[PDB]
């Protein structure tokens, strides 16, 4: 009958500079011979060809497909990806959402700490030097 595909992780949150691996799977009989990945954009969905910008990779086996995205960019990479598997009896699709965390949130306890140190130094340096 018709195939039923599902994502291993429906939503992921990786960070820039790394490489995300989204994977869809299916257990229908007959197995899914071909898989295709599309990136959702406003009013249109663009196919993800292997080797694009030397950073995309697609690895497909019977009923399972991995989408590797290297060097996570903050402008084009985050969003929704659609995997479509077409068995001899039909086709199905799954939706995976990917977010890219930046270094702003990653180096959060570094800026926080140095800011707090600065504030402390200003507080003590005005509370004593001129006020006291």
């Amino acid at each position, epitope marked *: 009958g018709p195939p039923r595909v599902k994502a*291993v*992780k429906s939503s*992921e949150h*990786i960070n820039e500079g*790394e*490489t*995300a*691996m989204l*994977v869809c*799977k299916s257990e229908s009989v007959p197995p899914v011979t071909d898989w295709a990945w599309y990136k959702i954009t406003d009013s249109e969905d663009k196919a993800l060809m*292997q080797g694009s910008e030397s950073r995309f*990779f697609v*690895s*497909s*086996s*019977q009923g*399972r497909s991995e989408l*590797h995205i*290297e060097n996570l960019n903050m402008e084009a990479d985050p969003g929704q990806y659609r995997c479509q598997g077409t068995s001899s009896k039909g086709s199905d699709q799954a939706i995976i959402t990917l977010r890219v965390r930046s270094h702003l949130a990653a180096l959060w306890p570094f800026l926080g700490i140095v800011a707090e140190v600065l504030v402390l130094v200003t507080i003590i340096f005005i509370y004593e030097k001129r006020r006291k």
Partner: antibody
Amino acid sequence: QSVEESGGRLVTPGTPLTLTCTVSGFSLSDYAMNWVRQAPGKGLEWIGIIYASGSRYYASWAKGRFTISKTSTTVDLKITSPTTEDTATYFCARYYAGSDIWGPGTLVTVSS
Amino acid sequence: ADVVMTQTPSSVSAAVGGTVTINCQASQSISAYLAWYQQKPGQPPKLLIYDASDLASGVSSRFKGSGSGTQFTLTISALECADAATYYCQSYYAIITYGAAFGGGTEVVVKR
């Protein structure tokens, strides 16, 4: 769905050596193959992987020391310069979700 | 940079019928692509769990993988004598960049 390694033997340091893994019950164009080695009484070392499209990726510590290739039915792993520290059992494994199907393994000894 | 897996503890024991746990800690986010393997002495390893939680085909329910992110844990219950073997975890998250390095290993000794 099975595989079978061959080519394990004793060789002198420096002499190259090629191991062959013959698949059976599935095509090499629809599944990837991993090469994993294990020293006597030690853990498993992941060597490299060759995808269905043909791309080959090697471990950081193993860059240059090995070479993976494949034909329509077998995968070959060539060692360009084996050392004494290269004696281990080498397994080939079909990659679908982790390594499910594994081979019996062939033993490669490097000594004088 | 290849991801390194820190498997602890090295050894773990339990009586027949008990429950053991094994923890694997990844050097980086390998959120859900970790497989667990059971290798018996002499025989080749056999895949036990894929995607850190899905049970492999023809595997008993006694094995239960849990965890995500960088911390994973495998647990066995009703420890039979046929469970005495070494267990290994393995990351396979974006192998083309971080490899598929294996864990140190965990020898599970039953206490009869």
